Write a protein that binds this ligand. Structure first.
Ligand SMILES: [Cl-]
Ligand SMILES: [Cl-]
Ligand SMILES: [Cl-]
Ligand SMILES: [Cl-]
Ligand SMILES: [Cl-]
Ligand SMILES: [Mg+2]
Ligand SMILES: [Mg+2]
Length: 342
């Protein structure tokens, strides 16, 4: 099993991808809008991915709501987390989790890269994609994100808290290539790290971002730092689940490492499943070869975490048109609940 999630180019698995999957057996896949055109087409894609894998593959997506939604071609839209936070509706948060879980399960998706546990500390901070945050302080994020994660998992879809160690505090720094968090660790555990600690039972996994924590490790970003991942995340935060990396194929991380070297470094640092989202095939064989150079006990530890995640994955609902109709109906009413509250 290749320890990574890889992306898929289109509506069906192509010839190069299928050959690489059979040969290398990636732990799973991440889907984007380019993979999602119709219900029948998506269920066929996820069925193909499961059939090509000996293990039960992670099949993941970023179905957050608002501007991070991958199902527009199906007519399935969802309100943003921030809008449901402004609405103050507790039932609306429950329903976002319940409806997301129901719809992803009908599509054969088994993991959702949510909740975002980043804190929107000031309404003046970075808003590249606005509306992704559940609140402006740790306690509101924990309450709202915890209700969300509970009802996503109640519906059988695995959750992922992101982005460790907390993007709300990350700032540009002309002394570094990547965003930087200069906070002391003690202050971090009182604020941006607190949602990850408080929600460990509700988080199937955690995704780490390519952020510099210079007071902990000034040479490697969090995803590639043994001191951040094994020290801060595993030892002091105590998280025992699967750790994903943010995409290694786009962004400033690519100006310093190619994706194959980056993925290997993240495994060595203690991550379990690096993300190779876009044009992954050139990078996989170098990773599969380098991975035999990892500490065998660390590899065994990571494999048991991935195997535990794999055993918790759910299979798609049996075909039933009225079930999908209810997904659309409930998704639409959820958007209307929010619009009527503005
Ligand atoms: Cl292909
Ligand atoms: Cl459809
Ligand atoms: Cl919004
Ligand atoms: Cl806070
Ligand atoms: Cl844990
Ligand atoms: Mg369509
Ligand atoms: Mg399988």
């Amino acid at each position: 099993m290749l320890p990574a999630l890889i992306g898929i180019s289109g509506h069906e698995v192509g010839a190069e991808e299928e050959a690489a999957i059979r040969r290398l057996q990636p732990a799973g896949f991440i889907l984007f809008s380019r993979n999602i055109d119709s219900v029948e087409q998506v269920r066929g894609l996820t069925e193909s991915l499961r059939k090509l894998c000996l293990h039960h593959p992670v099949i993941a997506v970023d179905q957050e709501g608002g501007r991070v939604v991958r199902t527009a071609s199906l007519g399935l839209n969802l309100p943003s987390p921030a809008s449901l936070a402004r609405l103050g509706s507790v039932g609306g948060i429950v329903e976002l989790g319940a409806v997301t879980a129901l719809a992803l399960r009908y599509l054969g998706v088994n993991l959702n890269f949510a909740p975002v546990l980043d804190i929107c500390h000031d309404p003046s901070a970075a808003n590249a994609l606005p509306g992704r945050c559940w609140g402006d302080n740790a306690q509101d994020v924990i309450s709202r994100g915890g209700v969300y994660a509970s009802n996503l998992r109640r519906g059988g879809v695995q959750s992922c808290g992101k982005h460790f160690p907390g993007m709300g505090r990350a700032l540009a720094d002309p002394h570094f290539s990547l965003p930087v968090i200069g906070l002391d660790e003690r202050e971090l555990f009182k604020t941006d790290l607190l949602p990850f600690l408080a929600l460990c039972p509700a988080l199937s996994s955690i995704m780490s971002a390519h952020i510099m924590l210079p007071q902990i490790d000034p040479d490697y970003p969090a995803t590639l730092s043994e001191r951040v991942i094994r020290g801060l995340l595993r030892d002091r935060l105590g998280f025992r689940g699967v750790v994903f990396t943010d995409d290694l194929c786009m962004g400033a991380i690519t100006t310093q490492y190619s994706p194959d070297d980056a993925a290997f470094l993240s495994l060595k640092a203690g991550c379990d499943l690096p993300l190779i989202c876009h044009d992954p095939l050139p990078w996989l064989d170098g990773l599969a070869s380098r991975q035999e150079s990892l500490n065998a006990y660390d590899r065994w530890d990571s494999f048991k975490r991935v195997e535990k995640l794999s055993d918790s994955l759910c299979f798609p609902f049996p075909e039933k048109a009225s079930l999908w109709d209810s997904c659309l109906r409930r998704a639409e009413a959820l958007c209307r609940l929010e619009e009527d509250g503005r």
